[PDB]
Amino acid sequence: ISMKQLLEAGVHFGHQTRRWNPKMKKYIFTERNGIYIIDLQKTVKKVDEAYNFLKQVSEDGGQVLFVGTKKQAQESVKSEAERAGQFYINQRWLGGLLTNYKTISKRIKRISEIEKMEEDGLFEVLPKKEVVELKKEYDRLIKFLGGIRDMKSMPQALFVVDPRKERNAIAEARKLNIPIVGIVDTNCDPDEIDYVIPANDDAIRAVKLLTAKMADAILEG
RNA sequence: CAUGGUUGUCGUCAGCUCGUGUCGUGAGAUGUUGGGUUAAGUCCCGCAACGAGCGCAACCCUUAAGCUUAGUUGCCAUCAUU
Ligand SMILES: [Mg+2]
Ligand SMILES: [Mg+2]
């Protein structure tokens, strides 16, 4: 990536001065109109480092889980994870998705069980109320766990868009020793993320650019 | 007011809990709280919770409309007759 590309995307913006995490002082560049500006040189350096890490893990054969439940990253994370053939979470992170995998896996298998029952002709025999409630359950399961249906083990890396909102994912990943690549905005905590990426998380263009670059890294790996 | 069994009552009020997870030094907590909705912990949304069980609901009985079987001691429509 290039500084001109980042500036065109809008990566430079940050949050107001009223809300801010002083642990990212090194990344803050300047102030403008009661908002902070990120250092794009350090941004590109960290983006290159994250690219290298993601490429190396992909080459080693690990799996990456994308988390973008933020409204400005749902579709971007969805599309980039689909492009890279990886997993994603863009609706809600269920408390215990990784630490309580012993039950989340059963919830995952419920999807395949419902599909098997539907394809085995149990659809019409069951009462109308039963089939409609099963449809509702299947829709909920796809909405929440749709992106990790084929995730049969713990991921080897977690790409998170906005850790401040994705507190749960950060906590579970840190507990389970899963490396994290984060789009850490100004008002976020960099110490939690293993591979920080100073960037504006409120900009659809910026988040899409960064997640696409990471997906390209994974594809190359 | 030593008891079994049986019963009334709040009240058919909507509660009572558990496994895994997570948070707590710990007893514990969460789930089960919040916004709505429902007869209902009923359901949805949200949410470090994810699910499950007993309660709730449903399965049982009866009533309200059809169809198949059966037509006596039930019914009377043609038909004769009382
Ligand atoms: Mg219930
Ligand atoms: Mg009942």
Side-chain angles (χ1 to χ4, degrees):
Chain A
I1 309 300
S2 176
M3 292 178 60
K4 302 296 181 180
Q5 180 59 290
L6 300 176
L7 194 161
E8 185 174 1
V11 175
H12 63 274
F13 291 100
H15 290 268
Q16 299 178 347
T17 57
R18 183 184 297 261
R19 303 301 186 88
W20 166 53
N21 186 308
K23 305 184 74 171
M24 297 207 72
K25 190 71 182 302
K26 58 172 67 59
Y27 303 110
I28 299 285
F29 183 79
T30 49
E31 176 178 356
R32 207 199 313 280
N33 301 92
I35 295 173
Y36 287 111
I37 304 301
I38 305 175
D39 181 4
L40 299 183
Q41 294 78 336
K42 296 172 184 178
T43 302
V44 296
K45 181 61 179 301
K46 300 301 297 185
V47 166
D48 182 8
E49 179 52 34
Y51 186 110
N52 301 325
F53 168 76
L54 288 182
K55 180 182 176 298
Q56 287 182 6
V57 60
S58 182
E59 178 179 356
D60 304 325
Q63 298 172 344
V64 181
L65 203 185
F66 291 62
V67 199
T69 63
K70 187 174 187 174
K71 188 266 184 180
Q72 288 69 27
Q74 308 197 237
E75 58 183 6
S76 306
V77 158
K78 171 77 160 297
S79 55
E80 267 59 356
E82 289 176 329
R83 286 173 48 192
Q86 300 298 355
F87 318 105
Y88 57 92
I89 294 167
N90 50 316
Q91 257 54 32
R92 182 171 94 89
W93 179 286
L94 308 184
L97 197 149
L98 305 179
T99 60
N100 207 16
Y101 194 73
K102 299 298 182 59
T103 88
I104 301 288
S105 62
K106 300 175 85 293
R107 299 308 302 169
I108 293 284
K109 293 183 180 59
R110 175 56 56 180
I111 303 175
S112 299
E113 185 65 9
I114 291 174
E115 289 183 353
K116 185 67 176 301
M117 291 192 306
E118 191 279 347
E119 292 184 7
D120 291 2
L122 301 177
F123 184 94
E124 68 282 7
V125 301
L126 295 166
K128 194 211 76 66
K129 176 175 286 181
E130 293 196 7
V131 63
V132 63
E133 66 176 3
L134 250 64
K135 283 188 179 300
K136 177 176 65 174
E137 174 180 349
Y138 181 89
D139 296 331
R140 189 184 302 97
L141 286 171
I142 293 297
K143 177 183 175 184
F144 292 140
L145 303 174
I148 55 268
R149 295 180 57 180
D150 48 334
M151 187 179 72
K152 295 177 291 302
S153 181
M154 288 292 99
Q156 283 66 24
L158 187 69
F159 173 84
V160 185
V161 166
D162 178 14
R164 174 149 169 166
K165 240 189 91 296
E166 249 53 47
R167 213 84 281 184
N168 279 229
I170 297 298
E172 300 199 40
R174 293 184 76 267
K175 190 166 182 60
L176 292 169
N177 305 131
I178 277 62
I180 303 172
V181 182
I183 278 51
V184 188
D185 203 339
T186 57
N187 72 347
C188 296
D189 184 355
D191 289 2
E192 303 166 340
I193 283 67
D194 299 60
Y195 297 94
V196 179
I197 295 179
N200 183 265
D201 63 7
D202 304 80
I204 180 59
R205 301 233 298 274
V207 63
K208 189 181 295 184
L209 172 60
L210 296 172
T211 185
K213 183 51 156 33
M214 296 303 96
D216 303 328
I218 295 169
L219 288 167
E220 294 292 355

